[PDB]
């Protein structure tokens, strides 16, 4: 087996490790060396990688900022950041997984695959490290990463690396982010067809949604996010800072009990096509710009920067987010940009095609 479709919007044309023979790593230790190693590979996964106990357990002492209920989330005390970023009451007793601290490094050339709905990691995410580039990682599901501690543990992370293309990725039941981006300027990173399942015994609003969804904290980079499914989260659905440039086309946001977007100074959005179905809060914080295309003929202005119209998004039961800056739209030209089917469509689609075992 190897790589279905090719990646659209800003990543169009990575290749991972192109026709490189398929490996098919036996234990957890083949398949960090086969991500880590300096040649273009095409990794496959038929079984669920499991690396919760690979490093051990820590006994320490962390904080419980979200309430001391069963079903609520504590934090680990990493840089003494209770006392620190947030002078703490009830300190507890925390036991974790040394694994899911730090993801797998991924090094250049990589196309990580899984076959049918076999294909996972648990106890431990991704890292794509600094300087690695052309990388594609499809239809895997990264799950169970310390479910109950904040900074147990990170999905997926992307840390200044360019040509990256995720898609068909399923992830639950993590400790903090399923996303987190620290690329740089002019990144290219698409994002497409995923499932992000914020459904989880222990949440940081006690409820049993995730907070710590996306978080694009990138420099000058550009990211496409088409077909995604973000489900059951409470936040962070995405948060975007810095000058990130955001192209979010046919997405499906449901059920999402508390917020949506956080766009932080400098983030440009253009929301367009995407679906909001019984999502109390769509816009959170506003400091940055964005366009969503608040009628038809608002989208017309888009013709002379991506060479056809935008679309609406649809709303429905959910909170608004009706903005109409423009400003940034001359930042798409030359660029390759995801086309956009009506927003009508997008969720029976997107619950169709979102995530692992759908490809």
């Given at each position: 087996?190897?790589?279905?479709?090719?990646?659209?919007?800003?990543?169009?044309?990575?290749?991972?490790?192109?026709?490189?023979?398929?490996?098919?790593?036996?234990?957890?230790?083949?398949?960090?060396?086969?991500?880590?190693?300096?040649?273009?590979?095409?990794?496959?996964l038929?079984?669920?990688?499991?690396?919760?106990?690979?490093?051990?357990?820590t006994?320490?002492?962390?904080?419980?900022?979200?309430?001391?209920?069963?079903?609520?989330?504590?934090?680990?005390?990493?840089?003494?950041?209770?006392?620190?970023?947030?002078?703490?009451?009830?300190?507890?007793?925390?036991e974790?997984?040394?694994?899911?601290?730090?993801?797998?490094?991924?090094?250049?050339?990589?196309?990580?695959?899984?076959?049918?709905?076999?294909?996972?990691?648990?106890?431990?995410?991704?890292?794509?490290?600094?300087?690695?580039?052309?990388?594609?990682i499809?239809?895997?599901?990264?799950?169970?990463?310390?479910?109950?501690?904040?900074?147990?543990?990170?999905?997926?992370?992307?840390?200044?690396?360019?040509?990256?293309?995720?898609?068909?990725?399923?992830?639950?039941?993590?400790?903090?982010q399923?996303?987190?981006?620290?690329?740089?300027?002019?990144?290219?990173?698409?994002?497409?067809?995923?499932?992000?399942?914020?459904?989880?015994?222990?949440?940081?609003?006690?409820?049993?949604?995730?907070?710590?969804?996306?978080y694009?904290?990138?420099?000058?980079?550009?990211?496409?996010?088409?077909?995604?499914?973000?489900?059951?989260?409470?936040?962070?659905?995405?948060?975007?800072?810095?000058?990130?440039?955001?192209?979010?086309?046919?997405?499906?946001?449901?059920?999402?009990?508390?917020?949506?977007?956080?766009?932080?100074?400098?983030?440009?959005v253009?929301?367009?096509?995407?679906?909001?179905?019984?999502?109390?809060?769509?816009?959170?914080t506003?400091?940055?710009?964005?366009?969503?295309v608040?009628?038809?003929?608002?989208?017309?202005?888009?013709?002379?920067?991506?060479?056809?119209?935008?679309?609406?998004?649809?709303?429905?039961?959910?909170?608004?987010?009706?903005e109409?800056?423009?400003?940034?739209?001359?930042?798409?030209?030359?660029?390759?940009?995801?086309?956009?089917?009506?927003?009508?469509?997008?969720?029976?689609?997107?619950?169709?095609?979102?995530?692992?075992?759908?490809?």
């Open positions: 087996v190897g790589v279905s479709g090719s990646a659209e919007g800003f990543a169009k044309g990575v290749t991972g490790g192109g026709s490189a023979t398929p490996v098919y790593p036996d234990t957890i230790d083949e398949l960090v060396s086969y991500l880590g190693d300096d040649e273009a590979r095409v990794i496959v038929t079984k669920t990688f499991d690396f919760t106990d690979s490093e051990g357990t006994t320490g002492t962390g904080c419980a900022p979200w309430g001391t209920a069963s079903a609520c989330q504590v934090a680990i005390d990493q840089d003494d950041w209770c006392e620190n970023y947030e002078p703490d009451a009830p300190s507890v007793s925390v974790y997984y040394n694994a899911g601290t730090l993801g797998i490094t991924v090094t250049s050339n990589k196309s990580l695959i899984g076959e049918g709905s076999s294909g996972a990691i648990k106890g431990k995410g991704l890292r794509i490290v600094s300087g690695a580039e052309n990388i594609i499809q239809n895997i599901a990264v799950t169970d990463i310390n479910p109950k501690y904040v900074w147990g543990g990170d999905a997926i992370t992307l840390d200044d690396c360019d040509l990256v293309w995720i898609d068909h990725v399923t992830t639950a039941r993590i400790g903090r399923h996303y987190v981006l620290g690329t740089s300027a002019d990144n290219r990173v698409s994002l497409t067809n995923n499932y992000i399942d914020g459904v989880s015994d222990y949440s940081a609003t006690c409820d049993g949604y995730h907070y710590w969804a996306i694009l904290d990138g420099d000058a980079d550009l990211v496409t996010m088409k077909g995604n499914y973000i489900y059951h989260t409470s936040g962070r659905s995405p948060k975007v800072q810095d000058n990130t440039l955001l192209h979010a086309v046919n997405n499906y946001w449901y059920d999402i009990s508390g917020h949506a977007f956080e766009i932080g100074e400098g983030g440009y253009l929301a367009e096509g995407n679906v909001f179905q019984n999502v109390d809060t769509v816009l959170e506003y400091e940055g710009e964005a366009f969503t608040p009628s038809s003929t608002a989208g017309e202005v888009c013709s002379t920067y991506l060479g056809r119209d935008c679309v609406i998004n649809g709303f429905g039961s959910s909170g608004t987010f009706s109409d800056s423009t400003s940034f739209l001359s930042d798409f030209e030359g660029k390759n940009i995801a086309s956009a089917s009506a927003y009508t469509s997008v969720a029976s689609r997107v619950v169709a095609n979102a995530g692992q075992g759908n490809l």
